[PDB]
Amino acid sequence: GETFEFQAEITQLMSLIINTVYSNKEIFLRELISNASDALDKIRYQALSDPKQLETEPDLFIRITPKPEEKVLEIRDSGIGMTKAELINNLGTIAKSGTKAFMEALSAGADVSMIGQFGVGFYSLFLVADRVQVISKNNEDEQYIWESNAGGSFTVTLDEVNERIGRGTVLRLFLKDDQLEYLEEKRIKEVIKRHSEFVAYPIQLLVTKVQELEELNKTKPLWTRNPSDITQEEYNAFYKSISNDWEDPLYVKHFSVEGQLEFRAILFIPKRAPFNNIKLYVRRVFITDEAEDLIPEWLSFVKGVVDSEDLPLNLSREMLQQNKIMKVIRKNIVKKLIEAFNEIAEDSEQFDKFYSAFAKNIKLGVHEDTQNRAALAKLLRYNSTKSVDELTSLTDYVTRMPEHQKNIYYITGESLKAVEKSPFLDALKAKNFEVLFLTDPIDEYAFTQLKEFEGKTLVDITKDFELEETDEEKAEREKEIKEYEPLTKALKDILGDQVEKVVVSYKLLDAPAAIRTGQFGWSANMERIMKAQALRSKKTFEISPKSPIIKELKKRVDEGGAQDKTVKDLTNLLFETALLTSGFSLEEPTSFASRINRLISLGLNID
C-alpha cells in the first residue's frame, strides 16, 4: 500500500469558505474587529515584559473610516502588527491561525484570552468586498501591503506610497457596488451594537458632520468583574445596553460557576412583563441569541447575557452544535434565578413590585415545570378571607391553619369582588377556615398540577367536597335530608338534564341555593375560561334547608304542586340565579330577563 498525504483544492476552497459558510453578510465586521482585538492582546502582553514595543503606538484603539468618495472601508488597529513572513504564512495560508499559536506559546499563568482559533475568519471580508488592501507594520519588520482580489494568489509589496504608521494593521476593503450599505453610519453602528458591543478596546468610527470620532463600545462588560465591586448604576447601564428597555432592571443576579464547565452569567429582571432574551458571549464576542433549550418558556421574562469559553462554536460562530453542556447551564440558570426569587421574597417592598408584574410567569412555572414545582409554590401570593388587606403566602396559610384543618381551600372567579362575597365561604367562615382567592385564569392551572403544599391537599370549594363533621350533626342532618327528599325529587325532574342530582347541602348559610360543579372535572371558572380563549361539565343543584325560600318550596310540593306553574317558574328562576352566583354564564339570557320583567311588573301591581 502506498501512502498519500491529504491535499486541498485552493481555487474551490476559497469559494466554499467565503460564500457557503457565513449566513449573514454583516459577519465580516465581527471577524475583523475580533482579529484587531487579538492583535491588541498580543502587543499588550508584550508590554508586561518590554514597554519599548508599546511606546511606538501607546494609544490602543480600533479606528473605522468609511469613505463614500472612494468606496473603501478602512479599519485601523494599533495591535502588534504582522511582519513580511507573517503576512505570507498567517494571512496567506487557509486555516492557519497565528492567534491560536500565540495562545499555545503563553507562559503558565497568563491572563490573556484571545478569540482567534480557526484561521478562516479573515477571508469572511470578501462577502461584501471584491479586493482587499491590508497595510501592516510591525516593530521587528517594515511596512508592507497585502493586496488580494479574492482570486487564487495574493501580492505582497513593500509599502512606499501610503501613510507611515507607527504600529498595527490597516485593512482597506474595496466594497462591492451593491454592498455600499456598509459605508453608512447606521449600518456600521448596527453591526458593532450586535456583535462587537463589549470589546475590551475602544472602537472609533469616523463620523462626518467636520469629522468626529464616535466610540461604539462605551459600555464595558461586567462579567469580567466580581459581583461585589459592581454598584447598582453599573448594572442599570449594562441592562440598557444589552436590551432596548428604557427602565432600570428590578433585580440583578450575577453568579459564576467553575469546575468542569465555567460560565459567567449576569441575569436581570425587568420592572414589567415583556408581553430569546438571553445572549451568549464567548470571550467578549457575541455568538447568537437563538438558543432554544437555554431557558424555559415560563422563565423567558428575564434578560441578560451568558459568557462562556467551553461552548462548541461552529465555523461561522453563528450557532452552537448539539451538545450536552447546555442543559447543565440551564439547570444552573434556573437554580440561581429561583434562589434570586427567594432573595426578592425576603424584602416585602421589593417582592410586591416583582409579583405585581410577574405573577403569571411564576404560576405558569408551577403548571409547566415539575422539577421545581414545590420550590416555586413558595412564591404564590393570593388574597384570603383573613388577608383582605395584603397578599398572603402559602407558607403563612399553613401557620394560620388550626389543628383540625388538613385541606387548603381556594376559590376561582373572574375578579376579587366575585369571590370575596361568594356564598361558598359561609361554611368555612363558620369553621374558621381560611380560603384563598383566585382572580386570574391561570390560577387554577397552577393548582391543578401542584395538588398539595406541605402535606395539605388543595381543595376547591366550588367542587363537591365533604367537610369535617361530628356524629351528632350527621344524626340530625340525615333525618332532615329525607324530609326534603320529595322536594329534591321535585327539583330534579323539573330541570331535566340540566343538573346531575339535587341534594340538600349544609355548606350554605345565607344563600337559599347554589350550583356546584361535579367532582373530578372542571370548575365554574375553568369552563368559562376555556370557552373564552381566542386560540381555542356536570352541575349539582344544592339547596339550603334553613332559608325561608326553600321552606316555602317544600310546602308547595306537599300540597300537590309538584307540576304547578308557579313552582316550575320559580324553580327555573332560582336555578338560573344560582348559576350567576356560582359563576356560570347562563344560556339564553333573554329567558332569564323575561322572568325578571314579570316579577318587576308584579311588584309594580301591573297585571
Binding site: 392551572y445 375553568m526 376555556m530
Partner: protein, 145 residues
Amino acid sequence: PQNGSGNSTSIYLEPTFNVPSSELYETFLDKQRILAWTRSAQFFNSGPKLETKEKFELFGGNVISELVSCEKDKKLVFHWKLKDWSAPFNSTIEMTFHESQEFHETKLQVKWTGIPVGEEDRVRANFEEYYVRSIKLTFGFGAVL
C-alpha cells in the same frame, strides 16, 4: 440476503386524566362517546357499546383496533393496527386504570407493544394528540395549556 421486515418494540406512557374510572372506561367503549373525541369512527357491530373481539375503524378507517380483553373499569387491551403498516405487524396496547382518591385524578398507565421500530415517535406523539388531548378537550377531562 432475503427481503423482509424489521422487528417490533415497546413504549410506556402514563398520561394523567382528571376523570373517574367509570367515565374514562366507558369513554373508550361507548360508540357515541368515541365518535365525539375521534370525530371519525366506523363500527362493524350494531351494538350500543364495544364487545370482546370487535373490530372498528377510527380516523377515516386508517386506524384498526380490536378489543380482545377488558376488565371492569381496570383493564383495556386493544390490538392496535395502522393501515400504513404491513400485514404481519399487529400491535397490542394495554390500558390500566389507577384512580387516586387523594387528588381526584386518574393515571392511565399505557403499555403499548408490537409497534414497528420506525413507527415509535409517530404513534407516541399522535397518542398525546388524538387520544390524550382530544379527550381532555372534548369531555373536559383535564386542563390543556
